[PDB]
Every structure is written in C-alpha cells, then in structure tokens.
Design a protein around this ligand. Sequence first.
Ligand code: SF4
Ligand code: SF4
Ligand SMILES: [Zn+2]
Ligand SMILES: [Zn+2]
Ligand SMILES: [Zn+2]
Ligand SMILES: [Zn+2]
Lengths: 303, 304
Amino acid sequence: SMKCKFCSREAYIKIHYPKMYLCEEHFKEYFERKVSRTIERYKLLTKDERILVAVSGGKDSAVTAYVLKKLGYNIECLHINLGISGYSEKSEEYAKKQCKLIGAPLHIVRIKEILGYGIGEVKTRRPPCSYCGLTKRYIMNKFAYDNGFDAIATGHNLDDEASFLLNNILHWNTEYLAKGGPILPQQGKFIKKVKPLYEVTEREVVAYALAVGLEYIVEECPYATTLDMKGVLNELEEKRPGTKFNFVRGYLKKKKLFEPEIKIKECKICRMPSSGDICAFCKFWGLKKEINFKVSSTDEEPF
Amino acid sequence: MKCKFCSREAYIKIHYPKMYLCEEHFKEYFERKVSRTIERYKLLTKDERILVAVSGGKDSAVTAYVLKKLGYNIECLHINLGISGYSEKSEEYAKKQCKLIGAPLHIVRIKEILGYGIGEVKTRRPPCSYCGLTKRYIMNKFAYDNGFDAIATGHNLDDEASFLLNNILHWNTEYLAKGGPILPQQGKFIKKVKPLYEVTEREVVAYALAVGLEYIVEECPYGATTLDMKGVLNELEEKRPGTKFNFVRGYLKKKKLFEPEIKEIKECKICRMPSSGDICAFCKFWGLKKEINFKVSSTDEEPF
Ligand code: SF4
Ligand code: SF4
Ligand SMILES: [Zn+2]
Ligand SMILES: [Zn+2]
Ligand SMILES: [Zn+2]
Ligand SMILES: [Zn+2]
C-alpha cells in the first residue's frame, strides 16, 4: 500500500520507530548498518578477530552469522545437537542449509554422541529447559576456548533482552540483572560473548531472513514464560513506541546498581571456571574425563 | 458454588489462595488481611490520630471503612480539586462515604483557597503533574497543622505493582528508592501508611459492594499510563497467579539497592514546610506570598 523512501520500488516493511517505508534491498542495507552501529557503539568486535557464531537453526543465530559474514567478519559456526528425537534432527539440517547459503564453516557437536543421552532423556525431576541452557553454554565456551576463538556471537535480539529483563525484574533475580547487556568480556577461561542483534527487534529479524532467503525453525522446543513476557512488551510497544529500547538502554545505565548482589575456582575434571571443586556441567553429567573440542577441520571441509 | 465456612452461596473466589467465600465471610477475611498488613509492617497503633485522605473513589473509601471497623481514631480529608463536572460529585460521594462510615469529614476547596481549580492554570504543564504535588502538600499541611499522627492512603497491591512496573520501565531509581507501605515521620513530613497494600482492586471492588459503599468509578479527564500497566499485570496474573505479590514483596527486599540513587534539606521561606531551595515547589508554583493555615476548630457537618 506504499512505496520506498529512497527508490521507486514498492514498500516491503514499515519501521514502527523511526517511521519509514523501505523495500527489500533498502531494508537489508538499513538492518546491516544498524548491526554495524551496534558493533561500533558497544565496541563488540574488530575485523582481526576469529568469531564463533552459535547457530541453532532458528532465525536469530542464522541472521547473526549472515550479517557478520556480509559485514566481512572472520566467522565460523557451531551447532550443538541437543538430541531431541523428531526436533534436533531437522534443527541440525536447517543449520547445515543456513551455513551453506552464508558460506561459513560449520562445526557440529552431538550431545547423545559425546555425553550419552540427549536433552529430555536424563532421569531427573529437573526440567530439560534448566540443564539444556547450562549444557549449551558450556559446549559453546569450551569449543571456542579449545579452538582459540576470540569471541562468541549469539542470536539474542532486543525482544529477547527486554523479555529477559522483564522476567528477571518480576522475580527480582538481581544476580542475573547484574551480568546482562550486549557484551560479556573475556574473564579467565570464559570467552568474550557478544550480541550483534542487541538493538534490532524480532520483526526486523523475521523480515531480514525472508528477504535474504533464510529458512529456519519457527517451532520452539517441546520442553514457556518467554512468550508471555514478549506478548506483554509487544502490547506496551503498540500504545507507547520505543518502550523496549528506552527500557533496555535505561537498564544499561542502571546495571551498576546490581553489582553488590554478585559475590573463583577451576574444575577438578575439565579445568574450566568452577564455583566449587567440580563445575556445574561436570557435576551434573557425572564426568570423570575432560571433553576435548579441538578440531583440525570441519565435517564438510576436512584436510 | 458455596462458601467454604457456611451453607451460604459463594460471593467471590480468591484466585490465590483458592477459596470460595460469601459476603459475610469475605468481609471478615478482607478485614483480617488489612489488620495483618498493619501488624506486619508496624503501620499504626490504636493510640494514634489518623487522617484518611478520601477522594470519593473506592480505595480511600474502603481504607476509612476498614480502619474505623478495626477501631481506629480516624478523621477524613477531602481535597476538592475544582474540576467542573467532576470534583462536584466527587465531594458528594465522600460526604456520603463518611456519613456511612461515621467519621468526621474535612473539606478543602482548591478554587476557594488558591483561586483556580486543576486544569484552569495558564500552564503548558499537564494538570496531572501539578495535581499530585498539590494533593500531597494539602494532605501533609492539614495533618501537620491539626497534629495528626499519620496519613492513610487508598493505594492497593495493583496500584503499587503498576507504580513499580512503570518506574522500572523508565528506570526512575530515585522513585523506586522511596516506595513501599510506610514512609516514616521525617521533619515536617507526616508518616504516610498504606493499609490496603496487600489487597487487590477486585477485593476492594467486592468489599465496597458488600458493605454498600458508593464511589466514583470514572477517572479524571486529564491517555493514562497506569491503566496500561494494570492490564499488563492482570494478564500476567491470569497465567501465573501470585505474580503481583511476589514482585511487590521481592521489591521490598531489594529496595536497598536504589538508596545510592537518592542524595541537604531546607525549610520554605513562605510556609516553612520542607523545601529543596529557598521557596518550596508548592509555594513557587502557585506564587504564594502568605502561608495557608489548615488548623480547624471543628468540621463543616459538626461545628461548635
Ligand atoms: S527451550 Fe528448548 S532449546 Fe531452549 S533452553 Fe529450553 S530445552 Fe533448551
Ligand atoms: S488523574 Fe486527575 S485526580 Fe489523579 S493526579 Fe491526575 S489530574 Fe489529579
Ligand atoms: Zn527502496
Ligand atoms: Zn568441569
Ligand atoms: Zn460463608
Ligand atoms: Zn512553601
């Protein structure tokens, strides 16, 4: 029903804030420039850096890898196959597809193969959601550490951070609120984690994926409070535009207030940053040996 | 359904904790819940002169009704904002409420003591901004001049949760530093309490209906952000019950974290009330040269 603000081509998307109608080609350029600005603003990455993009098969990580590669970054991708039968199989396939289109090396880690059982197979009263996050985070860091990557880039966008903030404020998880934001610096054996999509919304991600022809898993894991928070914040954004941004940017200014609400050791098994004698990952899976994630070359590209 | 304690038919269902109560059992429960809030946060004693700031709305009406039923030494104050077509019936609803409650009502008319009502001032500033400042001053000055020990407001759980949610979204750390059910006596500032702090609006609406309390449902003409936050929190309460309470109680524990975000106090050159500069915010705004004396010998309805 409209036309592009910079050309005679028909409008593809309307940016709710700031108001402007852009076509496919102009939206891509805008979205890419918005990401580059997020990198520049928070000093996330340099061009002389080995980056590991944690791809899951979803839209978020797919676009992160695509944009970073288009912006000329030294990226490689990692897929952690959780081993959820009927889910994780096509999830691995979507990532292979995504990385082939992107033109980036893809490394695959299969939980069922290295640990024994997949997520939702462990004889535990603990929900799969609780230990899945802990398992994904460990393999992400250990893989990047063992292969000497400078940084880890996740798919987490503005909607993801706002819903994370809203949930944590409601439950007053001050320790989690203390360590949030677009960058988590290199501290010990913990690799620097960045969020290049921190300032963009899910609608801009969905639209970007569609335009660049990126296929992803829309369906979410069978084992959620996240979708509740996101809908609540979308309702608020309708009435008052800019809410999500002003809330997230405001949080970054006041993030210093939660510092006294947060407190160290090295694991006896994997030597990774632990709280006690043995780390949370090693204690859970009952591991006696260290998983070595060092690889000479990818599955698709050996030698 | 039927009542959990008698053969009488259910009047209301408490979403958390789950129980069906009749009119007579709900009143008793609601009253006990308020008494517990008083006891828990050490809000009031029986040997205290209390001023309930009644507005004509459900909140302040119930606060006065419950406190009087719990045997407290209450007197009520109505601040008539002078909003033509609104403030007139608002004053009438309070007169009605206090007559039912059986409490002395003191009326202060803005248009009469200041000159112009709220929304009549030649200012680009919205009426909502200076109305709150004006209500707060008269509330404190009246309680101070008549030597009341405390001020009790109608603010309930939904009011606090929406206040918290809005202030967190705008990261107003200074406002978040000084929240909660009690604001103690500091200088010429009178102790402010919230006896309805733990009860929800649905429990207030139901209590008013049961005790036969008529109030103004309609809100002031001067879009309000409060109704947005409340609807958002009601949506959250549906899916996850107890959310509002766990969020408010959790805030009280972490309230200490916003203390470094609030930094000497002065006395006004005109009214001698707690000021930031030479002249206070109230006196500077209305351009007052003289001090308004709120000391009264006896009420409008009960003179001599
Ligand atoms: S939603 Fe699924 S993938 Fe995400 S943390 Fe939970 S179990 Fe793991
Ligand atoms: S909503 Fe009306 S009564 Fe309430 S503070 Fe604003 S102007 Fe005053
Ligand atoms: Zn265009
Ligand atoms: Zn370990
Ligand atoms: Zn009953
Ligand atoms: Zn003054």
